[PDB]
Amino acid sequence: KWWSAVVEERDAQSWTISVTTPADAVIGHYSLLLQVSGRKQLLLGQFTLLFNPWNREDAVFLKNEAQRMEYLLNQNGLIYLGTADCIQAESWDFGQFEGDVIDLSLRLLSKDKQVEKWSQPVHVARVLGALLHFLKEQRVLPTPQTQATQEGALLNKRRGSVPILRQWLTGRGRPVYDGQAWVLAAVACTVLRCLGIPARVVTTFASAQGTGGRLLIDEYYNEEGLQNGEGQRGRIWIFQTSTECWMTRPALPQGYDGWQILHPSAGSCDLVPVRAVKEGTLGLTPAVSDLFAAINASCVVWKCCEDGTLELTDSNTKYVGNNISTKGVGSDRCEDITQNYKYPEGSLQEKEVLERVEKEKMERSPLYLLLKAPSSLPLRGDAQISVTLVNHSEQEKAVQLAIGVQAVHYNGVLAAKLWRKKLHLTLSANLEKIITIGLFFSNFERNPPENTFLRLTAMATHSESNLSCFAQEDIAICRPHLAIKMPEKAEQYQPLTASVSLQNSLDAPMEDCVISILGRGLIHRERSYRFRSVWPENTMCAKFQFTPTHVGLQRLTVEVDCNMFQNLTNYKSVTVVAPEL
Amino acid sequence: LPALHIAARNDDTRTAAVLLQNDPNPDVLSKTGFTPLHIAAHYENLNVAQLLLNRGASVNFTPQNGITPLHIASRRGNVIMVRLLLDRGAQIETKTKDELTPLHCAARNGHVRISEILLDHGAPIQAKTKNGLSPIHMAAQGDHLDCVRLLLQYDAEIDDITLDHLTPLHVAAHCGHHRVAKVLLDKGAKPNSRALNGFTPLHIACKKNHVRVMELLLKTGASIDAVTESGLTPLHVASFMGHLPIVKNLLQRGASPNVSNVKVETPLHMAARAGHTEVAKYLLQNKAKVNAKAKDDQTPLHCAARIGHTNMVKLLLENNANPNLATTAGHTPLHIAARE
Amino acid sequence: QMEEPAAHDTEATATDYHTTSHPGTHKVYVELQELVMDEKNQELRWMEAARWVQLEENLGENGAWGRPHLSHLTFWSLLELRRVFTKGTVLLDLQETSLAGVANQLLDRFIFEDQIRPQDREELLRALLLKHSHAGELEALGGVKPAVLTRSGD
């Protein structure tokens, strides 16, 4: 159990000494010294000691093997973006097993000066979360307000996690703008996979990041159907990334081992077990209440007017914290672990927990509409939407209907006003009425930014009564598909031919078509190729040749840039086997 | 031998090595009856698994339970154990006491990769346990989404039934999972499919108070009007169970409180059998004729009198149902009020 | 025909590959080898010619090393070295463990910058993978002579 060494095998000029380690020891750069009774103590070398989820008696221990191989030994991950209605994967490279990651991580850790509390993963995780959130608040620059499309090909391309770590510690590379501030979780996961703590990166769509401790969110909307002014203390983001780490909690009461969410606060961080979020125990850790408020809280909507008087409006209820997803194990598909965060809505158990948490917090329409909109909208294209209206009154009524479309960043920040339309209708005889209207991109007023999502709002004002009905939907923008053709198995030290196909679905000819291939263990760094003009009717088809070198499971990525769009990424996996003897 | 399994639990290689060097017994039963290979499959210790499989460890060695070691390895989810046990030889198509296939236990826990490997190795996708549930039905129970996608992609007959005719939409609406409901809707399903009771999935959603499933089903186009084999409507089920927001949504989206069952009963009659007050106010707010006759021409005051509930009456008296009204037998609300 | 694209160099993404780890200081030992062919069988092979531990020490035809001495060059050597290094190909921080992978990546990088024609890749990959003898085998070989490669490989 304690530090030990046995001399197992003996030769006249050699000894084979087997050093053994205790289960609870401080990690870091060690040094071995040999001291005979006579001579001065002699330096023998250096090594490093890390955590092992393979040992049974250590705290951070994983029983299943494939979970270990996916969560600890893997390097080629996925991060899910987009709206909850259509989820788009993006290939990401953690690269935790590079050369410099371990020494950089230990140098970041060593600014704590509390040495003996490094034997435990809780203290290390909390400290590293706090430091990485502080560094993100330090080195992230706001977006340039001026429009630079010619440099938009360089502002928003990401290569992995390690260049961002280097640029955050030393500041000798490209900065990361506010358009992509969600990298932080992945970075933290990188550090934990370096140190021995299993971790993964989850995405919560429609999360309530903002102020916490209150189960209600206010939103203000214009008479025309937009949002007057900018910002709010608590708003509903389109998505939000977070980090989960697997460990055991000895300091807590018994029954909380497993997954924990790492939560930094605006600096002291802390981590909370997921079962605490499901059961709802607020008083176990000061951070549980805000995280539980972050998942299931409801919003109310206010109507601003010309007089300045705010009005409540009756709208359809929207859900918060749905479609929790992450990378599946041993494959390249998504899996939802959302059953670990909430009960099914409308059960006795979830009603019980809601009533209990509300009791604990207590101590501290004649017409309506509804909207059908598609989940995805093509670039340089069009779609159809429909609004129905049902009245319940024997008398006829006049109504004014407004429709607004506008792009929004991923953190609720307004970007540009795009479209609005106002019309008058007369409903009669208590009959429903459906209005179908097209939406063409050519009818828009401005070009959308690089990473935005459109918010479509509809507001029906009754002419007689000032109480009005409201609905909103979110739509992500879809880009043309990028076909990769490549065989499943390849032989080592052999040529391999990949094919890439692209169809110009867009109405504009592409110019300055520049594509690039890269991949870890397949091609050395990065390759670039140029092309001719691609007309809107025709397609493009290209072919590349390389040769795999490292046996096992790899994947390659392709990336396309042009004048219409930038950073269109895709990936494909391959299994390479050792050659036959 | 009560310690051979302890050596299996701790993966003690040398101790078991001596124990099989001396003793010739490769498999003994505990008081439960599980072999050392069964307990080796649990804690995933595979060096001893190799040692056992080198000699006599029958992969198809079933006790009276019939639980193969492959069943437990697929249960807890160990991948390399599945590959090892299948490489040394395994009969996939076996039965437990409850006739559970390895695919059944794989689908219930949610391990998607074991299901991929097993269906690659020729396990029959379509199957029927003692009841007759397919693996897709059981995986649809435990809210395993990507397993549903995988079973659909390789091979699946979607509109499968069992002894109680249950589409996977039925179990999805009975267990409250809208996520698999989306996939089953857009890939292929029929909302019109009815169970042995004659129930739509909308009826089950009205019973068990799931709302998002109801919204997805009605956005698909499951009909509002529907007749159970008893004679009920989803409005009647929602009224009898006491769920207010389901009533609100169903009455907003277009419904008629004036509907008759095989015994002529409004949802006011169907409500005053239990006395949910707010649903009664909400149904009365819209156009429903409180002056009504039941099968024996009992007024809703007659059905309300057996409850003994006080303030439910005054809301009914707000729409002035007369106490002059009496049933066919001549009984009046005073008569039943004195009877009860 | 499937039209193959042309190359294009852009250093916008180079700074994402600059490591920060200090390599340190290390002494060097240089070994030079060149293509030859032995007399008993017409087989090309790489043979060492000199070493640079402290001074240049050359290997004679008899197989015995001579005296160390200072290193003097010729002007054409330095001129052609500057010319060919001005348009040379560099590969920094390659992640390899065997010579075949280094050869394959170097050949692919050669093809990328249009140094050689694609139909010559097979011949160079066959050339760079022959066996590398040492000083002990020379007297077993009976002598070696310069051997320039040919397209047919003879």
Curated annotation (Swiss-Prot), chain A:
UniProt keyword annotations, A-Z: Cell membrane, Cell shape, Cytoplasm, Cytoskeleton, Disease variant, Erythrocyte maturation, Hereditary hemolytic anemia, Lipoprotein, Membrane, Myristate, Phosphoprotein
One Pfam short name: Transglut_core
Modification after translation (UniProt): Both cAMP-dependent kinase (CAPK) and another kinase present in the red-blood cells seem to be able to phosphorylate EPB42.
GO biological process, one term: cell morphogenesis
GO molecular function: ATP binding; protein-glutamine gamma-glutamyltransferase activity; structural constituent of cytoskeleton
Keyword Lipoprotein attributed: yes
Subcellular location: Cell membrane; Cytoplasm, Cytoskeleton
Modified residues (Phosphoserine): 161
Free-text function comment from the UniProt entry: Component of the ankyrin-1 complex, a multiprotein complex involved in the stability and shape of the erythrocyte membrane.
Annotated disease: Spherocytosis 5: Spherocytosis is a hematologic disorder leading to chronic hemolytic anemia and characterized by numerous abnormally shaped erythrocytes which are generally spheroidal. Absence of band 4.2 associated with spur or target erythrocytes has also been reported.
Other remarks on this protein: The substitution of an Ala for a Cys in the active site may be responsible for the lack of transglutaminase activity of band 4.2.
UniProt similarity note: Belongs to the transglutaminase superfamily. Transglutaminase family.
Protein name according to UniProt: Protein 4.2
Curated annotation (Swiss-Prot), chain B:
Tissue: Isoform Mu17, isoform Mu18, isoform Mu19 and isoform Mu20 are expressed in skeletal muscle. Isoform Br21 is expressed in brain.
Post-translational modification: Regulated by phosphorylation.
Phosphoserine, modified sites: 256
Residues modified to (3S)-3-hydroxyasparagine: 60, 258, 291
Stretches forming ANK repeats: 1-28, 32-61, 65-94, 98-127, 131-160, 164-193, 197-226, 230-259, 263-292, 296-325
Source organism, top-level taxon: Eukaryota
Disease: Spherocytosis 1: A form of spherocytosis, a hematologic disorder leading to chronic hemolytic anemia and characterized by numerous abnormally shaped erythrocytes which are generally spheroidal. SPH1 is characterized by severe hemolytic anemia. Inheritance can be autosomal dominant or autosomal recessive. Patients with homozygous mutations have a more severe disorder.
Subunit structure: Component of the ankyrin-1 complex in the erythrocyte, composed of ANK1, RHCE, RHAG, SLC4A1, EPB42, GYPA, GYPB and AQP1. Interacts with a number of integral membrane proteins and cytoskeletal proteins. Interacts (via N-terminus) with SPTB/spectrin (beta chain). Also interacts with TTN/titin. Isoform Mu17 interacts with OBSCN isoform 3/obscurin. Interacts with HIF1AN. Interacts (via ANK 1-5 repeats) with RHCE; this interaction mediates the primary membrane attachment site for ANK1. Interacts (via ANK 1-2 repeats) with AQP1 (via the N-terminal). Interacts (via ANK 1-13 repeats) with EPB42.
Comment block on domains: The 55 kDa regulatory domain is involved in regulating binding of SPTB/spectrin (beta chain) and SLC4A1/erythrocyte membrane protein band 3.
Protein's recorded name: Ankyrin-1
Residues of the whole record sequence present: 174 to 513 of 1881
From Swiss-Prot, chain C:
Cystine bridges: none
UniProt-annotated stretches for the region Interaction with ANK1: 147-154
Mutagenesis or variant effect for residue 61 to K: In SPH4; Cape Town
Substitution effect: residue 101 to R: In SPH4; Fukoka
Modified positions (Phosphotyrosine) in chain numbering: 17
Cellular localisation: Cell membrane; Basolateral cell membrane
UniProt tissue specificity: Detected in erythrocytes (at protein level).
Post-translational modification, as annotated: N-glycosylated.
Involvement in disorder: Ovalocytosis, Southeast Asian: An autosomal dominant hematologic disorder characterized by ovalocytic erythrocytes that are rigid and exhibit reduced expression of many erythrocyte antigens. Clinical manifestations include mild hemolysis, intermittent jaundice and gallstones. However, the disorder is most often asymptomatic.
Similarity-based family: Belongs to the anion exchanger (TC 2.A.31) family.
Function: Functions both as a transporter that mediates electroneutral anion exchange across the cell membrane and as a structural protein. Component of the ankyrin-1 complex of the erythrocyte membrane; required for normal flexibility and stability of the erythrocyte membrane and for normal erythrocyte shape via the interactions of its cytoplasmic domain with cytoskeletal proteins, glycolytic enzymes, and hemoglobin. Functions as a transporter that mediates the 1:1 exchange of inorganic anions across the erythrocyte membrane.
Record protein name field: Band 3 anion transport protein
Organism: Homo sapiens
Gene name of the encoded protein: SLC4A1
Positions spanned in the full protein: 30 to 183 of 911
